[PDB]
């Protein structure tokens, strides 16, 4: 075997190049994991928290630039949050199975496997821009209206999802700007 | 010989790399471990706050108490500057407006709220249900239901509490409602 030489010093040299690679695929994950920290860290003081004078939590401030939906359905017994996020990039809404994975789980007779997506776009580096895309056979009303193509939505806009949720979406940097 | 000496001596230093990839992994794993933890612990503290998160990505969107008495606002503007909600615990949290030297706990906005407007008190003894009254400042309006308050008044669920004919809160008692 006159290549047993080359053959063995080969794999040594791709094996060099793995180990550097299997090196960063490590720093990789410790870097999202340390940032995913960064915004967790934000959170805990972000929208904000009130302080009672004895040092007690005291309230939430809605989120100040970030889009979102605040619940209006009027008993606390909501296995739904209060509030919602847009998050920038793609929202999904719908049913809890998880054939395609939903952001905002919802209950009802109503609600469909996937309901509604929230589309958040800031392409621009301005002013977050929220579609509203309906899903075919889902019922989704804005300020009254079945919609069933995508729409702009706006601060103030009431969001109707199925027969049992009712919400009022929130653009506070959208107001910031046509407001002021 | 040297030359069989030479192929012991090469071969050892593979298992002696892959021991090292081995303990490689190991004390990345160990690091990647400890540091996903602190962001755990952060989102722990997080749903304490009533922050809803999924496991993996987090951040959902904010709970209704279920346990403790709050005001939910009412009021749409998307900057605003109260609370979307204020909690309602244990002993005094007083509402007014921040000008005012003595400190307020929760600060109302607009020509119509007195420095002290109205105070909230909550007891609870040994019998862990709290009791919430709602107690005036003279010259300040605040009305509950419709009904101007003008002396301590115990508060129940569902009840729509206005200040300054200005200042829209629902007063939800999660744990009030359970008992009817």
């Not at 952001?103 to 821009?129: M, P, T, Y």
């Amino acid at each position: 075997g006159s290549e047993f030489s080359e053959e063995a010093i080969e794999r040594l040299k791709e094996t060099e190049k793995i180990i550097a690679e299997l090196n960063e695929t490590w720093e990789e994950k410790l870097r999202r994991t340390e940032a995913i920290r960064m915004e967790r860290e934000a959170l805990l003081a972000e929208m904000g928290v009130a302080m009672r004078e004895d040092g007690g939590t005291l309230g939430v401030f809605s989120p100040k630039k970030t889009p979102h939906l605040v619940n209006l359905n009027e008993d606390p017994l909501m296995s739904e949050c209060l509030l919602y996020y847009i998050k920038d990039g793609i929202t999904r809404v719908g049913r809890e199975d998880g054939e395609r994975r939903q952001d905002i789980v919802l209950s009802g007779h109503f609600i469909k496997e996937e309901h509604c997506v929230f589309r958040s776009d800031s392409r621009g580096g301005s002013e977050a821009v929220v579609t509203l895309e309906p899903c075919e056979g889902a019922d989704t009303y804005v300020n009254g209206k079945k919609v069933t193509e995508p729409s702009i939505l706006r601060s103030g806009n009431r969001i109707i999802m199925g027969k049992s949720h009712v919400f009022r979406f929130n653009h506070p940097e959208q107001a910031r700007q046509e407001r002021e």
